[model samples]
Target: QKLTFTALQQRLDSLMLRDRLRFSRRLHGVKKVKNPDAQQAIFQEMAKEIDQAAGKVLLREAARPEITYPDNLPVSQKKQDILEAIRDHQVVIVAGETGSGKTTQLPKICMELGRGIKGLIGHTQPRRLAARTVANRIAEELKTEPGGCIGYKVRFSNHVSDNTMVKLMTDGILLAEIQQDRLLMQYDTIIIDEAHERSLNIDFLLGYLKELLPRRPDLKIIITSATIDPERFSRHFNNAPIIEVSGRTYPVEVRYRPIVEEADDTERDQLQAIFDAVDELSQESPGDILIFMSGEREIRDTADALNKLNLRHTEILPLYARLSNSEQNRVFQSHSGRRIVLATNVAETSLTVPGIKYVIDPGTARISRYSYRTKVQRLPIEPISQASANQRKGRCGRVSEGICIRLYSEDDFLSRPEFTDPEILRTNLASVILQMTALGLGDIAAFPFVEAPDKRNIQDGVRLLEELGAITTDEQASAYKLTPLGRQLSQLPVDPRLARMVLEAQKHGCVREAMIITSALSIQDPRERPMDKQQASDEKHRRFHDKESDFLAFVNLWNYLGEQQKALSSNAFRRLCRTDYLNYLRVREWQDIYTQLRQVVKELGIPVNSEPAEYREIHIALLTGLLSHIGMKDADKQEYTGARNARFSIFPGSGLFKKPPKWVMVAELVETSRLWGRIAARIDPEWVEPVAQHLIKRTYSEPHWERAQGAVMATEKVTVYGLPIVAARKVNYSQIDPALCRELFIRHALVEGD
Candidate 1:
């Protein structure tokens, strides 16, 4: 028994485990340390004392680098004050303006207090890119490489090591970790950066942490938000100490150009206002200018408009919701020409475009909203809040002096939302509902939300969860609970509908294709639609279109891109994306997310088949996820009957739009000018009966004696999720109601002597 460690020691030494332990296991120990025998040995009481001594030595050395905070950074000046607050309190609110360096410096401040040795610092940002870059920035400042004392983890990307003292990740990543580690025991300090964004993940995280703080007194929380509404967080934490780190208040000249209201006057359109602002700002100063437009289409139109203006030395760059990474990089890349950036609100909060000295605020942004009536996500142009407007102005406030032109009057700004209203707007509730259910949390309304969500969103969220067959409600007990399927769905990080599709793939031997298509569905479309190149791009996109289904077309595109990507070098591949009107960065983003889903689905007991999938089988797997989206054509109306009393037509972008198939299942049912069906696929209505029997509403009518069978029968009809199917079918009434059938048979066939 004693030799077991000795015997393992031979293998361990061969791999030089002790050599690395001496070198500092926190930094160098890896595969050699993975052995169970070696791991167990380290837990021995005697071994513990020696290993801890080694760890402390390594920790002190890791801390040896001269860590200096940049001077005058809003957070840097308050470093001492923050440390005192954190040292005294369990929770603290770090209210800072943009460029305050709160996000990058907060962890280092924790470093001074020696907080991360017992566990990770657990810093979280909202975006995957932000998480990775912020981690790199922190490590660079600390004179260390990433995955050393500092590491980061996003969806598919991971850079952490056993020695990792600071773990930077997306808020989604932290929420996901909650499944594996309930108390968040791995983190001694959790910094929820940019909590002012108040995203769905943030609110849920804040609510969960509110319940967790009292239980773990050792866990320190540093939440950085805007200076406004400091009380909301303070009150939530029961008046936790607040520290305000004000950014250098600089002089920024503001100009207003309210469009004339009367048609009789010389009223300019929104585009003209932008043109005037650009001309004035460009000539007025020698600095780059940024114009905030609403959506991708608007950005494209302005790009076209500015190109025609022929302003030499004024280069135009576009930034919006789904611009490719290479394209986004160009905005930040070194350039000498006078630049004009047409950007969305995506560039407004938490992101500062360097060299921005003049700002043009149109005050319109595409806010995402979920329709309880349509049960689909909508992106519509909405006015920005007062805080968002101030945030926009702050983007240019980084310079010593700046100029900001607003298309709307200051009075209009005052009337806008004080802060964003309806904190629960824009997200699918199925995810939130599933999360709460998985957490075993009590009532949704009772959860400590920054702002309560609408009742319809909650009810609809519950409805979709039930539709996906992911949850169960105790009618007798008035409680929502998880089913076996619900439990599996909860474990997956993607949307429940997409997760539900993976389970269906196992039955049909199309797990590989289903994974690819579902991954495509989860990300923004890689197809680029620049305004001037509309005809050229659509012509190229047609090469992949399958007349039968858009889903199959995506599979075709996936295969095509794979072969092309491998055949050519990266630069050539990127140029090809530009040539073919494909979004290079978006494709990369898609692959990264696709990688994440593939790994998770494999863990859930799916072994993808090597054989190619049949078209029918590939689509049937999709049907399980989108059963409620199935619709039938009404030839007379030129539309499909989707929900009861609602009719929608196929969007022009879909391959099925031209054909208008007799039956199709839409992936999105959205509304703007009209209810539209997008990303649709043709499906056989007959396929619904076997798998959808539970949801099919069945009825019997027109009972009569069938002379040939000497029995009574009725015409049976069925409707699946509000779409009618099996309109007129014969069914023997004897099984349905024997007494009624016997009475009818006796009266017509026997007693009446027919």
Candidate 2:
């Protein structure tokens, strides 16, 4: 009998009852199955349940598309050289500048060379968006739908299926996958793209791969990076062959215009220097100008100033991460006449603006540089490195011969760090420590990272993990080991500190509410207080305020959001987010995080509550992991003295700032001009003693006998880290000295009865 798949599929779609909603999402995937047997098997299983495994096998054996390379791309032109390098050596180091087509074309070369047949060709990008766009570009070139033959997976959002021959990924999921797939059985060829950035995960993966490559001779690695520091990568892989492909670039002239001018009447600041540079550039050229500002404030200020210039037929625009997606698109959107683009370091290398013939470098960028004192990764404006300055220079030379003006002296540029330090040197590694200890990777310092992290940073990470009760040291091995609590924290896909909150909430019967707030804390705030709409946004946000706990404010928003989302259509909900001055993208991300977290927590044997948990329960759950973040108010300084002699003020926007709690726990400490404690919640000092007993320090004084209690007593000063929890507290002294307290009780209380 002859049967059609469409008739069977239509009947199966109607018969589906086991999570019909979930099945609907995957219906298109079922339709993509080409084999009649697999398609018929899926329909037959519809009565019992839908097992999609039958189709996955068919897709797994599907043929890959024919490979081709455009003659124009620089990497494509060197196709033979790259192909030979991949075949001869197990590893290859590629040095190509941006726009050389190295990112998109490298995988095609591997496909053409008979790779991706037995195993997948895995490509790693530092960011998710880049991986996503590259997946589309390669799929379009091969005349196939995205996620058909070529698939990409970011955190939570997965597109890869059994049939995918080429997989694109962010380094995070790939590194995490190594835990289960030791020796990497699936990937035959791995392309580590953009290795020059040297992120923490990239450094670790390179080290891990160095060890893995010997065990698996069939595995091939292609390390693609900017022309900078390709030798180190080559040397690391046993003198791997290096292929350098030059990008299309024109000569760019650099001039140093120091802020201090000969005509000293006007006190010129950085912004003033920018105005001077932009006016000078406008006089000479008719091309678009890109001016690099430090951050949002500087960009907005410079945009206003340039607008005042009233340059005919010139449109001034600002770009930053916080801007809405549509707003950010304006930098790329085509427009008439000349324009001025003011942006942050995001434009340095991540984004390129078209028609940029002139660049104004204020020579500063804001990044997370950990301070030894604060033990917090502070976002402070620092002078740009020479390499970073060159990335800025590369932008203008794209369209034509260009000019780059530095706001500082040539000596200032020379004195900056030759190259930016890798992220391992600058980030908190408590998260890393948890992952490594849980996986039994010994001694972070001894690991063969591309560059070893500073020993001081490793020690700091150990202290942080210990503070969170995530890890404890083995007495004999003298190495870190996961505690029972640490083992559970490592199970959840979150920061060690944040994951602890969920475990704590489980005991208090508030896993449901904590899940919402924890998800909110993980992502950027959805409540967008744009510069122009600050007042209106604040007014809208005030309704969600919980005076004692900012964590509750998130719970409040979630509670309200649950109802609004259920009632409205998606577009209407999006409009609602806009009307309420909330970032819809942030809201969407927050919901996705919550959904993913809910699944993991449920699978981990943690229960979720339908009813809300008490406010005290949620705060206590949050405080367990944030013990080091506690602060005590200083009367004269008007700032909170935090752990390790750190000091910060309560953020102005916080509800607790008006009445300043004596003791508060902050979600984060950010440093700009001054340290600011943000996302704060007021807490009673009594709550800290039990949880932080491992790290708490106490000193006893003023021993005396009390006849009423018939026991000796003493005043104790209790502290955690360095901040005092109990300044002068009278407590029973029997633990310190049973004999001494007995003597005092006998001599003073029995005889004198004082």
Candidate 3:
């Protein structure tokens, strides 16, 4: 017999759980149904709603269990201990090195304990490709097909089915799921893989889950990391039990060959040092070689120089995040002979390239840092830490005894820090603060972080929010509240700046154009010019160049793709991309992102439609969103200074770089070789105040009564962040308050106070 709402309410009251009030609120305003026969229909619908919220669907037959455990792996030996630890403690931290198989094995171990019999065994990877690859591997081991018993979910894509018992998804997917299912009732066991990355999402999830533990006593969490500081995680979870597993790796011989110091020749010196080491190694060596570089430019530079050397029977491949899937896949394919792979820090943690018995460590990688004072996020090539160097070495020793050649001294290696700074500490916190506020998490400063970011960073985030009109200060002026715009901004899955741009564009009737520009900014650029083919590629790209804006240039590129999507077959589109040096993969990714953002726009009740928009309206939308990025050119030096007076130059890759405008706003400021503005657009100085009146700072000269003109006149200076817009302009002083006039007189020391 089904219980009536009246009886259920009484039972819920007797339980006296903290969530009872929340549960009751769900039933608020529901019609009262007293008849037992009619009540069942309401019960069914209510139960369905709960299930959908939990991201669960009822399955009939049990999933087939035909999984195999690799007996050779070290994690397999500790399977029983791991399960026992999970059985005893609510949380368990697995400290395994890179080849330990902890990431793949731990979830299967949980499955063996009948953990997924009732609900799901959720696994999270930090990357989309990793999630999909891990799910495919697990499904293969279980003797089932991919996207069947084991499936993956990433942005704009989902493969999991109702009968799926195991699911692998990116950490962000689960973080987004928190909005719907606060308790995460869909999964009984949650496994967070790659905890050592210390990404913003992972850090916030750990803290949020810690607070969620007491209410969800039945849930089990397994944290798997590669050489992460387990003690810190243990202490965070009330001394949760730790399981140590040894990885199966051969001894790696380390060699130090530091580059000689040279004046103004660091890059060439490093490249020469790598080549010297490669020259010394035998071409007939047993395995492939992996060289760690800082970025795509370095990777290409090394690859080009190495290719010119004409190394015998060798294949050189470049690897980085921006590469297409086909290009990345080349690193994994077995070549006829020795293969030399040049890759970035992405290879340090997220992926493992097979058949690398030799490693060339330049001991540097690009790291992202945000300045609170400058309000810019910059990626600077810096030295890798001891932990990162060791992780690079581990990549080579996976299959057999390997040799790691460091292009730095052994002393330099020993002097490196134990670990790199976590992303939360060195990144902009605007997005984090927005998520925290939307989630109803109180006092972000007080939230339990494994490592808390600086207090000033939080304040900087609040200031940026105020500038964006996303939030307003309270009456007491102590705390801030989300404005209606803030609530809408939170709904969009984009950076706060880009989100604000979308909202502002809706009002200007140019959302469709703004949507493309925002999505392009959010993803990697869809154009590439290989070092050897730069001239030819540039010639092809010149057709789409917009002299006034790199922002509109992106719109031109996207419009071309849209036309091709309709006029050409998929294969023909690929051919066109190859002929023009366009990145087909990134263009497809842009489309996918656009589709995802479009749905969010529609869901937010912003009109989900597009019309032809002028370039003027597009720039107006950009100005509203990126006002802080406004800069003025130093015509003499051919340089620009931003609102904070930070000096920068237009990136050579930008369309307007050849002849940068006097007044412009950039999509972002990045530090590669130098501080450079990327995705810049020319804007008029007059539009500054009209687009962002609230952000304007004004100063007026002393007013003087003029009987001839019948009004008082004063000179006004209009500025933003102390950067001048209008240096001086005549204005009516009568409209100004007398106190303000008096204050202005004393501020400029026009005369001593009477």
lDDT of every model, 2 decimals: 0.75, 0.77, 0.76
Give stretches of model 2 more than 4 Å off: 1-62, 161-163, 179-182, 261-268, 308-310, 322-333, 373-375, 428-443, 472-688, 696-754
Model 1, residue pairs in steric clash? none
Q: For residues 1-754, what per-residue lDDT tens digits would candidate 2 score against the true structure?
A: 3344454345443321223335556555667888868876665655234445333333444576778776667777788899999999999999998778898889988888877755688999886656776888899888878547788988644548855778999887788777777777678799998888887668878988898887878789999988888998998888999999988777899989988744322222555687788878878887898988765654654576678778889989887555555675577578888988888777854566778999999887756565554444434457888998988888887766799999889999989988987777776677667766665556787677776666766776787778888777659667777889888876675566678889998889999888887777766577888788789999999989997888889988988888997898544665677778776545655665687678889988999988888867888888887898999998766699899889889988898888898899998888877889888999988888877888889987778767787666788888998777778887877667788767666665434222
TM-scores for every predicted model: 0.64, 0.61, 0.66
Model 1 segments more than 4 A misplaced = 1-64, 260-268, 320-334, 371-376, 425-428, 434-447, 454-457, 468-692, 697-754
lDDT for each residue of candidate 3 in 1-754, tens digit (9 for 90 to 100): 5745675455433321333455577565355666666667776676555544333322322454755797778988888889799988899999998788788888788877767645578899888778877887777777787646677888644547866778889888888778777888777789888898888778878988898899888789988887668887888898999888997889999989999956223344666788778876665364788888765645655687788888878888787566676776676576789888888778876678888889989897757666543444444446888998998988888655788899999999999888989987876687677767766555678789988887866777887788788876667556556789888887776667888889988877888888888877765567887898889998988888888897888788888888986898544665577777876545655675587789899888888445778877778887888888888998698788887768889888887888888998988877877788887888899888887787899897757655565655678899997778998997777676566656655667433211
Ordering by TM-score:
3, 1, 2
Name the candidate that leads on lDDT.
Answer: 2
lDDT of 2: 0.77
lDDT of 1 by residue, 252-320 (tens): 899988775442211125556787888888788768998887655456657877887899888887775
Looking at model 2, which ten-residue stretch has the lowest summed lDDT? 12-21
The reply for model 3, stretches above 4 Å from the true place, is: 1-61, 261-264, 283-286, 371-375, 434-443, 468-688, 696-754
Weakest ten-residue segment in model 3 by summed lDDT: 53-62
